[PDB]
Amino acid sequence: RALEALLTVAGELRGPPLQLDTGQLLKIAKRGGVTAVEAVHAWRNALTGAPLNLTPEQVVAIASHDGGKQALETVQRLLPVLCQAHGLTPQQVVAIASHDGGKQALETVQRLLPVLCQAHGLTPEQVVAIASHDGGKQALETVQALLPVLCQAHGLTPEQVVAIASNGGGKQALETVQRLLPVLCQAHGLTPQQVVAIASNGGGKQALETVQRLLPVLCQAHGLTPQQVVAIASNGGGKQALETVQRLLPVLCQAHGLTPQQVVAIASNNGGKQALETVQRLLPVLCQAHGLTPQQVVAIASNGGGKQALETVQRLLPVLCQAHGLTPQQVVAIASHDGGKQALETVQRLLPVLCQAHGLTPEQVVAIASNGGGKQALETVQRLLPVLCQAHGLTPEQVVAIASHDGGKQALETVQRLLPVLCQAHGLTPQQVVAIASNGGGRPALESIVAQLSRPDPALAALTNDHLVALACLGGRPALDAVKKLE
DNA sequence: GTCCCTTTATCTCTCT
DNA sequence: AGAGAGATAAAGGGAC
């Protein structure tokens, strides 16, 4: 019964004004549901046209959530009242709106941002942070409710209260800190800093509780220190991570060899449980079928989704090496980040049309993949490389440089965006723009430079454009912001 | 379906 | 280049 309505709406939504594609409408259907896709079909015009002007990807972002219809409805209602009335940018709104029950988060933002700023001294960016989640309305109401007692009875700072509330089930973590802080500190000598670190993670309640019940056991019985424990607790799925460490402590330090430290290191990211289990399974495989060492595997595993990385190393190692002519060290390198599954996969399916259909080396490609988000890097190269070499006069080595960093996608995009405005309007050369973009944070660096030239902050008008450039190159937005307070 | 929560995976910026 | 920390995205389960 679901397929009928999806096929009915689908290649009518694939046309104007949305131009959506398979994967896109797939994402909507399997999270916002058929209602979401129908609502997108219906209000397709009101969403892209003024005064909303929503980009397609932004629409997709609002719909693909339990409630997407309501989220669209409410965005169309209060997209200008929030901007108009609370100086919010439309992107901030779109960010509040793109979670389960965005309609509540939006309505509650409208209703509470004033008091939360005036009565409790939040900045709009803090309020938007609290609301930008699943059960945002709840987090907001619980900040408004609890912030005075947490600050006054428990000695936390407003910032800490915001950190706790800025995740999944923020309310649960706030109330759990309210309940458990004077026990975690009293009877275990933790600090408010530590209790906040534990709670400032999705499922934070379960993390705090699990710490109260398993710290004495992991520590005073499995030979761990409170520091190692809190370390494990201070990521998402910290309860699962803690319990899994407690089970597998003696089932990995005497079997596979792994040491306590290695265990806690693999347990100290998102899905630490998964990564630990996958390590228990795959460590003897990859070391005696792929030739790898313990150290390498533990590296691949000591990341977020480390499980996915382990399993994709298993799956893709020989084929990438023996066909695509990569080496083990290289592959371990590409995998040793957050998203190495996506990295390895994207290398596998793209190394062809970059080496062949362009002229990239596998080493260049490997360097593009060896940086967190590598997938996005590579894909954005594959799109924007003809654009950037035919219509802007860049050499491939330059594009490869720009993508050879975290935020590569962002870097390259922001290059094509502001490639003539700074070169034509302000007199920068291409090599300058590339030079700026070729670091971590190229996108915000380029953005602050354009934001400088097109309206000189006098403290920085005191420098020649070139100095500005070399400055943006050596430290980006942070350094360009730092060399203004010094005056 | 719509809202809230928890767990898990991915991406981007800053800091040296 | 690594680590830390934020942010965004995906998947699933309880509740009504």
UniProtKB/TrEMBL annotation:
What's in the keyword line of the UniProt record?
Host nucleus, Repeat, Secreted
Annotated Gene Ontology cellular component terms: extracellular region; host cell nucleus
From the Swiss-Prot or TrEMBL record, give the protein name: Hax3
The keyword Zinc is assigned to this record: no
* Localization per record: Host nucleus; Secreted
Q: What is its main location?
A: host cell
Q: Which residues form the signal peptide?
A: none
